[model samples]
Target: NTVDDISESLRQGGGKLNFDELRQDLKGKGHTDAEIEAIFTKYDQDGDQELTEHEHQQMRDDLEKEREDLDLDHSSLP
Candidate 1:
């Protein structure tokens, strides 16, 4: 799973990006608590309890970085 999954869900009239929901979302995708924390750390740009626009953008960046590492999308056309 990726931060974009959470961000897209939030952007598309979904619920807030709280820790509980983040935990559930991640567990649904087979993530452990420690993994979730690490993932959240990358995207939680402001270290706040909730996600801000900067955090969301950082999430997207993290996702894009993962995609790049996997050689999934070398261009914008993905």
Candidate 2:
């Protein structure tokens, strides 16, 4: 849910999201600019300096899968 929520916030920016806004958003969530910026640095992937939807889809899908994994993991715990 956290990943989805974060992804949705990004989707609001349409095709390309400004790094500054994204940085601020993540900061609101308690991540430092460097911490959040490093994530964007990876997600942006193409060195384009902005986040693109296509670049994010795989990350989104992976996050969803990871969330399901966590749910399953929790369920299996005592």
Candidate 3:
């Protein structure tokens, strides 16, 4: 898969994943704390660092809203 493909997959799968685990993954992928937090801000409706299962859904919704707001298309197979 391409980088875009991997990113798309991650975006979709990330909502179900643990926040800290996802943070670590992004870190491994070379995301800095600021970058991570920027992305996190889009998903964290309550501004919480830790994401609960229900909060994960909120993250998904917020991400979807962001996509719509930005007119960005989700890559295939996410």
**Would you list the clashing residue pairs of candidate 3?**
none
Can you write out model 2's per-residue Cα lDDT over 1-78, one digit (the tens) per residue? 234345434454466676666766776776655557666665666645666676667776776687578778666558
Q: lDDT tens digits, residues 1-78, model 1?
A: 645354433342132476666666667766567767766566654545766566576556767677668775567786
Task: Score each candidate by Cα lDDT.
Answer: 0.58, 0.61, 0.55
lDDT of 3 by residue, 1-78 (tens): 113222432364433444465666776676666666666565555554555566566656766677676666566554
TM-score of each: 0.50, 0.54, 0.45
lDDT of 2 at 7: 49
What global local distance difference test value does model 1 have?
Answer: 0.58
Best by TM-score: 2
How are the candidates ranked when ordered by TM-score, highest leading?
2, 1, 3
Deviation (Å) of 33 in candidate 2: 5.4
Candidate 1 stretches with Cα past 4 Å from truth are 1-15, 45-47, 70-78
